[model samples]
Target chain A: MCLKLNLLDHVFANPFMNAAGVLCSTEEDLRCMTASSSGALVSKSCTSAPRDGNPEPRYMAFPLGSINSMGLPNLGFDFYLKYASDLHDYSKKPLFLSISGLSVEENVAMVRRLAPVAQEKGVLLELNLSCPNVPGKPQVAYDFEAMRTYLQQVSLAYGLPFGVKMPPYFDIAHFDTAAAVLNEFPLVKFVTCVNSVGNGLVIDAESESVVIKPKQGFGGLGGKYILPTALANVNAFYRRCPDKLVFGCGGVYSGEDAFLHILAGASMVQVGTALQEEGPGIFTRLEDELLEIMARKGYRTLEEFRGRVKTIE
Target chain B: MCLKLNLLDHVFANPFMNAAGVLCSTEEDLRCMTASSSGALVSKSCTSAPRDGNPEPRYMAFPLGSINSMGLPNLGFDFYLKYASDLHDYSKKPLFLSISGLSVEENVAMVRRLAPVAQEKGVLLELNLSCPNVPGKPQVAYDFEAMRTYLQQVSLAYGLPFGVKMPPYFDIAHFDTAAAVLNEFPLVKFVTCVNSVGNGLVIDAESESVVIKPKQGFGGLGGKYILPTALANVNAFYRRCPDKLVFGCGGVYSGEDAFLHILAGASMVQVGTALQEEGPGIFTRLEDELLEIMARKGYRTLEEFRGRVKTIE
Candidate 1:
């Protein structure tokens, strides 16, 4: 079975990749992902400057899922840019540099810095428009006007194709409007389906307290609990944006989850909570499982069933 | 421990109740709920007329949660009204009559019919503004203009106090606007925090097919997978609608889930998927578990910690 997929004009070894803000935070983490069987690697979303992030007990795992208020902890844009540029010297896999700018100007500045080397260095820029844990900073993707302004400025700054990481939308009209906005920009080449289910509060019953340490225990939710929602966002945009690609993120654990994302029109499926829990090696297991499932179904290539998830009449 | 709660000038035996569309669709189911340890019971949201609902396999349960597209199947307005009137004569528990009319006019008509008996029959009306299963009809709650118009007409048609069952809002702006709209109508005395995470797609990996049959395998999501989202909605409204009472629904299968809802500011915690899976007897277990947790913390009443969930400073 073949799990190879063509995304952004590049043929990936397989559709498996690490979701932004998982294990792709440090040099060691990126090296492990680069050395793994994964098709692509994404750096943790970075701010204009380095961040120490939120207080301790910022992330917790549950039986069904996990809650996180990591607050965009990253080594800053300069660090990730240097890493991306250096890695291109020997890395065969595609590298995505995620930027979660504190302001529109900051985002455009970062885009300007990367535009010169993006194509030559094999770096794909995925603008992080949906970081929920930042204190007092609302997700840009949730604000359609801000999202458009950022897109307009960033597109003008780079004059090249790029993508955006979006937060999950629960309402149908929201999906319609948000997709319409993305459709307006021809330079918006790809759209990641979700960042996380934002503002979810998890409480520990025995202690009668909220879990995690930021925003009064409010955080983004991930893992198995969100697969249904993840699939919805993936399919919604897949149906809406015909010209652009869609990256599936959130709640993916095994090959089955990856298969579902592909069926829902995801060109690349990303691992988050499971990747953090199981490490980079999980990518190999995921690829193998996907291949096994594809073989059983007589699917030699992902294109055969990609975006073919049938709707009941 | 005392689990009593007072809302709309009436005291409930406890905060546990059945969510609309769960085991409350049939007379037999309603009787079972009334006879159980539940503090109150809600009737399935009724249309102006009877409905057979959508095609078969409209509901499927998973380890984490359940997906459903029951399409508001009910015995119609007349049947539920008669039951509500009769139950008031002999029952000690509160009976909430839920209405999810197909259109604004239908909702007003039902409200008109219920107004004459609402005060005398002890039937608390919960207008369901969010039902995602109906083929082409968008959720009323998702359409701000439509929602406001419906509230204006329904509140005018029925001068008596009533409540609304809302769909979950993922964006901070959405939460602000929706809650603000609800606050505008003083007659809207109570607000049910959620009506399932809408438009979630669940797929069967083994068969490679969508789970539910309605709307091409799309359905409303419920149960443990939605607890965090549910709490967000609960807390969002709880904080925004200070004048209105809140009823929490979604992702509740245990006492801990119920306790979390209360901590998040839900005056009443309703059960859906869990109630369907475990039957009315599950209410007893949930109540017992809540009491045990409360007792361990030396709590004697629901108000001691209700809406007191601590936030990170």
Candidate 2:
């Protein structure tokens, strides 16, 4: 029933954590997660400065999943760093400090400031390259050359192991290209497969209106709607980036989804849409359910089945 | 509440139609569609020769969606042409003939053979550039260069207006590049936005085994799971390819879903996963529900709200 695992030089009591930009945007949110039964926590993706984000009704849940155009609202990097510094002294759980700068220079600057304390504080840098909410800004990971440029700069500035949060890549060529780009930077120690299936639009059929109020209702998709996509991305990167670890995000609503992610080669699994709707207590439920499954299978540890998904013969 | 509309010089009794690769492979399937309430019918994506396709258990359906690696299984081009010739003589519903050759040369060869009968028989060609199940053959549309090359050759061989069924494009730049490529040839009269979110894998958690039996269980995903991706792709091309019409396909299981696709700028809507699951009778249900919605909204024709999806102000 033990789900413990070691990743990126740290031990995780469980493989579950809140996906960045969910229940991790404020001190209250972080404190709640810190007290939750989850194995780790990730800060909201932060910029150089705080943001107000998009207008109201920017997020909506549907029968299958949810969509959001939060526009990267965060309390800024300094606030999270201060929180990270304090959390390190008191907590054993890993803290992933997610940064989504408006520019490459901003990202590099943030990395430079954090590099010195990253290892000591047990703060893993999750450099988010995919933020679909920001209007006029295309996701960096989608553009291979720009992604390479951003990675090169971040690698040079940090000179330390880090992970890049990526958007879902649908094509095999995209997977190959993005993986090749990441492999070029040895400092990138892990990859979080899928931020969201970006720029998706949902409609309120009853009103004949778009649901979310950002970018004309175009937002990122998550939940059961994207489970297949998340697994595909996770497996794609896990196979391509042999040197790097891969984390699964998107559509993980239950223990089964989490197990699927691991089977699809995710070293760690994250929750977003379901977490947003359920709250911190969901971690314990997920763990209990995951443990029940693991126990029934006569497995005691995550590693026995981790990344061991068998393909059709 | 009439759903009828004129598209590409032909009248559509309604926007409801079966997506390619579903329920149109054999003479019985085609006759069934011809007898159904669907406004149009699309033949199975044909190849130069008949294909046995992938192994057994190559398709699976989940709660929210479905997946298949059917590997372009069809009765070959000539079989479809003869069926097309027969269907055209008897049925008023437009019949869309789809072709997915193993190579560009084969596609051109088929196009040359079908050209003379194409206009007279009222069959619209749907050149499928996005079939993900075939082993080792990358989707042509995902590779812009290869896509453009295929389109160029087909345009040269046919010299007639046709449409291309595309795979989903997650990145904005990809949409731009793909639309730019499609726009380069006026011969491409319509574009079917999305032919399943390609290369997605589904797992049966209990057995810890992949769902399908082709390419190690990687398959094209469909149904409610891909509604957002479908709408996004439909809208992206709708905006970019003003000269060409866009048909929506992927995840239309209900009238609400079909309505959303139209709001997102789909001129015609096609069903696949739901149709596969519910049978051809599902079209009658879909059309009836769509009409009810239209009646409630006080709409009289499909043109009233077609392609008028509004965004956040």
Candidate 3:
């Protein structure tokens, strides 16, 4: 009974890790996260081919968080797949590879190749079903049947336990519908609760104009703005899928935020805007803050307080 | 140039008021808000036919917020139509009637009867496109074409400067689509930035069970959990729809939250979960807190700091 975080077949030294689309793209970013105190590290999300993504000023940092219409810019599936397949030993930490293929066929094609390789390389696959910043991609998770179909075909093809990075759903029916889809596939084990609150508009108070360039200055919102929605989705899916594992993503800047995610039923926590702003060392800071909260609440282990938020009569 | 909150044709003593769902269900409820020191009042959202709504324990309050799937439990259109059409003087405070018809034709049907009546009664119309708690409905606002079609037909039929209560949208593309649809309808004079972040699941730590029974414990969520998303929506629409007004909803429990909403571009701000928890008196507390903040920030008029959050280099 300690601060160690446990999941199926693996135990992390802590619940801290970088979220997809942040410091997960290049090897320097990956290697930095690896050498740091992070419990795990993830590869950048990739499509079947490389994308230059949206134009300049695609990502911007603000006081509370950041916004980006980075357009899923990456070095293609082969680049990340090669990187993941190259990592033979994950004893020091676990590694996850993210994919956001441009089409259903592309996703299936990538995962078909990824499944056997992930098992062989001791790498995890995170199918990114939500990337709001892309030029013409519809919110994949919003289409219930499409998502269910994608998961069905991909899970069967991948033929292994894997995770999904999902969009934030605001309806209970959506939660019920989404969880039902994921639960149908026993192999789809862990679900990352959210992938940024899609399409938030930020204005430069000084200019009375937008802050970013892509899609006429509309971009996916990250940081403090998404904390509440992030927690709600995490809790929604957590309670909805009792048999499945839920990983908390979004709004983790400090230990308190991480504790809230755990309290909301996320077994592991992932960082996005915060990691990009503060760098890999944020993992250590997060773990310390979480331990302090545990100590104050008289919680010896992560499980003691995880998913234990109180409701008044 | 003081803190007088101005809008179309009338002036609110302040920007604080109850959102559509919280306490505006009956004439008595509407009357109490009128008698209270709140800035304004809105009617309960309506359907063409009376609905009993979801089963009991549909609503519950926690430390941070509340959740429920009341399922549009309101009296039929005529029930409120009689009350609103009867109101000859908006001097007590302006009244806004909310409508959430079960179908598009139903919305048109109600508005055909409502448009002339609202104009005659000096009542403003608020077309609610985001009813997450309804039993067999998808969030209308989530369906871009559907929302656009509904607004177009209803706005033309209503033939007036009305408001649209939109669901909180996560993607920038969604914001683009929703706002584009809204901007097309010039009659949509004001856009309420959000409804509750719908379909959140609440669990009692002790029971390890859901707090609400509807939809297997899935319900619309409100309170502090949605403040940031709420603010982002207000600011988003505020910037995107230059011709329209934006009302802030979700998580306005205090003056700070209210101020943040205004700073984000809400012309008027609403209280839902907080108002439900604290009752009408909460509005007075909110206004006081807002004034204190305004005083400290060295701003006298609401417009001085309204929509004026700064951005950095």
Candidate 4:
């Protein structure tokens, strides 16, 4: 079965890619993704300079999902730029550079310098609007005005087709307002729905202590636990942002989840919690399973069923 | 197994109750709930004048859950006040009178007149900060400053303790900010973790049309689709607001869902979609199953396992 798909002018052999901040932070980790049977890779979200992130036990795995308060740790923009310039080969696969600056100015500075250069080098930009793990920093997308101002600056300074990572919105009013802000910028070509269900606590039953320690065991949640919400966000944006594309993030542990995402209107799918636990090679397993499901449903191409999630009469 | 518990100076024989806006809009519906097996009930949200809400087909039920854009349809505040005065008895389960005014002024106006007298009558107040289906009006909790301003005015005018029903928050930063906002008003004693996953569209495979008519088929989502996120929000606020109590809403078609919500630090659990679909009789099934599970686990009381969800060490 063919798994070919296209988004933002690049045809990925498959719609599978690593979600930002996992399996994409270092040159070594970056190389691991390229060597795997993955279709694409995204770099870790970067700030102005290097950051150590939270503390140890910052990430933990459980049967259903995982949680993290890594606090946007990365090798900085310079490192990702240099890494992208030197190692990213078009013949290999497409690449995405994620940016989550501490402030709008920091983001504009990095994008202002990096956008033109990355476009020249054929790399895509993913501007992260929500980084919930960062202490003292309210996620930009949560505040409508803040998000609009940041997007306006980023669009003006970068002037490139880009995607945004949005936190899940649980209100229709939010979808309306957030979509209005997004539709204002033509260059905001795609939106990735959801980062994580943030600030969830996982207590150790016996010890009664919290799990992660970045903000006293509060962190971001992902994996099978978020499938329905992820599908909802993807579908919400796909309907609200008629001029823009929407990517699905969160959940996606199996091909069934991926199928549901596409049915819910995701042009592309990202893997994070599952990837971290199963290794990058799970992309092959996902493709195999997705293909099998497609064949059973008598679908030869992804488009025939993509975004066709049905409701009961 | 023991299910009795105390909150806000009232004792609950069990944790089952009707979520506002469902099956409690009129004298007949309110009377029906009082005769049912439910441990408690909340009145339909009240506004300044009587409202027709959206239109027909505003609510629908699927196998897993239900959706609605009822637009906060209800009788005027006077109707509920009279209903509460005549029916509310401390000898019965605590009765919560939900109020969702269109503006802060309207809320202050109503609560100022209602709260003082309601306190004397033993009627509890639940100020709804999230009502997604309201046309043209946004949910109050999404705007932190607006929420704070509204709560401050309401608290001052009323000069009493109360609870808030909040929309689900998907970011750690949001949890931090929202919790901080709640903590500021120590009088804001109880917090309900979620209203609904808002603006989800359920389509028909054959008709290829939406199930509901309001807001172009966008409506609030509930039932099994929201279990994980519901638990996350409940636990998130539970951990962040040490001085306040958190209630869980969303998902919950079965005992397992209810059990999980309690484990996630909910002081109490509210049933919505299931309550609408199954009538109040489902509360008995839920309690029976919950007690069975508790017996199997050797748990004699809800508190023994409440807020004790475990993660791997």
Candidate 5:
């Protein structure tokens, strides 16, 4: 009876979502999505205009995991709008569109453009506040003021039940501050715990060169190595803000890993790198594995253990 | 019941000794063995003298997994002799020593030194032929002429059962050659499927340097990435030489992983990196996890599924 969610399809076409600021997502990427038999799909984060994004060599792999600083390369609102309707006709699974912008005005503009299509298509909207861009700050979404202003404007402008996706920051002060700020907005549906941990790099000694391109350096870390940290972050958020919804992200490659996050505290989970590593077939494989784990654990439904850890207090 | 063997201890101490090469291992490092509660321990690859080993940055981590050129660092024979009695007295589990050498003379010398201790302490010996040395030509244990000479000498010198550890060479000719050569030596007890796959490094752009120290421009790849390849090698050997005993190595980090190797055709599985990643507690955790998997699968004994894949033929 476990309820399976398809966060992979909802976030990006496949696990390989252009690594943030690298290559812009294309229609061809969507081909990988159909192969994913997941129940839901999350589109890549989109903005008002097509962005060229940062230069090449954006991603780097480390012992613990991989990191990339792609600078949010995307096809923008017009491109997504052109394809948004087709998404509905293409797949039976629920689609979640991820929207992002530099300012509240831009975010609202993008949301307004998609709101009608989303309404018609019955697709859910996810407001992305975790992007690395936005002025007056080194750390974007970590600033509670920026998040508050953006969330308030978008929530009021869209009048929709959309979740907020965040970046993993070390300081909890901003997290508490953001949570307090978010409490003021009842329309905000849920919060995805993290996008990814920022810019990590590795250098080879023999060649005297950097392993990945975009020599400026920095990228988000994700994969099996980041699971422990991802779980802790989701658990912390669920503990602090019980009223808000929480979706776990990062380092979920297998059904067993997904179940672990749910057991820890996540209501739903997002998978990224695993899809990239295993390909689109990962969805069916993960689903089968998850079902087996659920049966073994006596989980009659996903909700049976959803955020169950929050009750420990 | 699938047995999870902890082979780390056997490599570093007692009856079976390590041959000297690069990088001298200390008794302090052997403390890792005491922490394990596994059914058996496989010692580190040791030698007769202290070895400085290859220069720095001998290891590299990639998205797929890690690669390392350890160069078979070990304390000389005298040190191994000094520790043999202590290894026997301190260890609670059965021990299987992993011994290596650069030449036939060195191999025979190590056997002579440790064979008496192995006989006295009831420990087993496993001969490692996967060490990368800087000989005029790359040393390959599977070479029919070289293996025949070495095994024949070792078998004649030590009237004890010893396991021969091999690397996964792409050429089937080499496997056939080694099998045919070793079949002549009745004293040769077993064969270990593989050591690690030699893989290259990535260069870092920002630093204008290689991401890892590129020994021979590459190192040995290990972890989950090598599981499938290791299984295929073990299964191939099992089918080609039914009389020869085989142990599985590489990419075994969990009880399920170990069980997979057993089902493929391995009699016992050697876990290396898992101990490094999770500490000695991994063996116990694997045992518990394996037990649960067995209960769920309705598997009562290791023999029920060991080499079951061969039935397909």
Candidate 6:
């Protein structure tokens, strides 16, 4: 039987919320969920060095969703290396490492360290190219030039199936830009389209106060709000680059939602906010629902409709 | 057949950003998807004054979602009154009014204004009590005293079937607190369990800089993450206060998800972020999918399984 799991859980059965450049800060939180859901354990987006992220109130909540401006906040490569080495002692679920950097060389360097870790531990690396909250240089995956340079360098450095996580952009034209960029680096195994748009906030009118004061007044949007957008974007990319691997990540709150992503052309889907909102049992609930969907759909495996779609065109 | 329309379109189909927050902010920029797919218009959360929300970058995007700390940025009550008056002239969908306030008096005043508008326009008034990104005294709804006072005053003032929206807190005990608060007022019709978990952020590492500032630090957590949590909370309320109506609001990204929410015991379900992400067309997709699910389940109308699980115990 094909076992479906959220991308993060597929990596780390119990993942830690590694915010603010601190990977090892909350073991209790990670262990609490990991012990229950023995799936993949994925770490937070890590960088090359230990760096403090933006100031306080880094995240904000809305009625049905949330946004954050957590600048890659991570203890650089050195910390991750040590942390990964230690984390290896934990669960056996495949590990997926999330890496972020400012420059192509920096990203490559981070991957170089991760490549050995992946080789040793049978882990995969996810290159975070699109974090909207961050400022300065264009996000690697979203910017054609930066994304191409980073992918080429990282693919060359890590001769493994490395995936690039992108941010959902407002413009569909960016998909073409991304596709053209990826064409230059065929070795790039897959693409994880979209990351959290950055730094959104809500204020109080009565108090004349801003509740979430990030650098920008905004943050990444997630949850049901982004599902269709994410699906459409993923579908657009899947249509444009049939050979490219895709992982849909957004608004996937249920197994049926997962099915929608798969139908839109995602090989695998990531579950983030859902996991947070629903708690650990969500994974199991989704898994059960997915089975029901698969059975009803007469598809035993996820590949049945990996990119199945009926087009009017 | 229930003809679903965009709440924004229902009230302010022709207004710009649903001018003055009286109508749904259907600005092209606010447009996430075509209206045919989603439910009728929902006005942006509005307050009693014509206040410009926080600065720009009010909304951010992620791979699967987006976040906005617009700070209940609306054109106040008087402006909304005018806007609502203007909306009467438009060909809109059923309008649902979303109201937020800092105090019981403020809430009462806003509801008083909305009650007449709702009655006049034949719209639904949604009392948004859980706004996490908004700072100060009203941020946390756990204070039963404040909530009771507010609900009572608003309920008395509006004399409408007003629904109270809440954040998902760590304590399920708060359900009772909320019930206790609402019990004092017979006019409060229903409750929408769980707004987004507030105050979160993501940071960057490459640049020795922070991406966005840390306003609230954590915003609402939605999508798949909060589904289970929302379900549990909604179910808990249903179990404890069976007759008290409940609306499931968190992480409902699809029709099936909505179905699940109903199964879990919500009288009605509100689509928030999904509408934001997918745009207006999401309602259509949801309605179609809902119908398909209903047909498959041999069920008709929302009442078939509204709180169906309550009998299981």
CAPRI-style grade of the A/B interface in model 4: acceptable
Candidate 4, position B303, lDDT: 94
Q: Which 10 successive residues of model 6 chain B have the least lDDT summed?
A: B13-22
Give me the displacement of residue A176 in model 6, in angstroms: 1.2
Q: Where is model 6 more than 4 Å wrong at Cα?
A: A4-26, A29-33, A36-39, A89-91, A132-137, A199-201, A204-208, B1-313
Candidate DockQ values, in order, are: 0.54, 0.59, 0.22, 0.25, 0.01, 0.02
User: TM-score of model 4's chain A, to 2 decimals?
Assistant: 0.97
Could you estimate the TM-score for every candidate? 0.94, 0.95, 0.77, 0.81, 0.48, 0.49
By TM-score, how accurate is candidate 4? 0.81
Model 3's chain B yields a TM-score of: 0.96
Steric overlap count per candidate: 2, 2, 7, 2, 61, 135
lDDT of 2 by residue, B146-265 (tens): 888899999999988999999887767677888999999999999998888877888888888888888777778998888888999998899999999999998898888898899888
Residues A1-313, model 1: lDDT tens digits: 5677777877799988899998789998888888888999899999889999999789998777889989888999999999987754334788889999888888878889999778667688999887433343357887778788888999999888899998888767778889999998999999998788877888777676787888778788899878999999999999999999999998888998999998989999999999888888898899889899998898888888989998766
Q: After superposition, how far is residue B155 of candidate 5 from its true place, in Å?
A: 70
Q: Clashes in model 3: which pairs?
A: A170-B198, A171-B199, A172-B199, A198-B170, A198-B171, A199-B171, A199-B172
Deviation in angstroms for A198 in model 1? 1.0
Alpha-carbon runs more than 4 Å astray in model 2: A86-92, A131-138, B86-90, B132-138
Cα lDDT tens digits, model 6, B23-79, are 255443223322343333446666666667665555554544444446667656665
lDDT of 5 by residue, B86-147 (tens): 65544455656667777778878888878888778766777877543343334446344666
Writing each residue's lDDT as its tens digit, candidate 4 over A159-182 gives 889999988776666677889999
lDDT for each residue of candidate 3 in B1-313, tens digit (9 for 90 to 100): 3557778887888887889988888778888888888888888899989899978789989777888788888988998888887742477788888999877888889988987887776788889998532554467887777787788889778788999998887765577778888999988899998898777666543354567776666677788666656777888788899998899998888887777778788888889999899999998799888888777767898888777765433
Q: Candidate 1 docking category?
A: medium
Highest DockQ: which candidate?
A: 2
Tell how far residue B239 is off in model 5, in angstroms.
58
Cα lDDT, model 2, residue B128: 94
Docking class of 3: incorrect
C-alpha positional error of residue B107 in candidate 2 after TM-score superposition, expressed in Å? 1.7
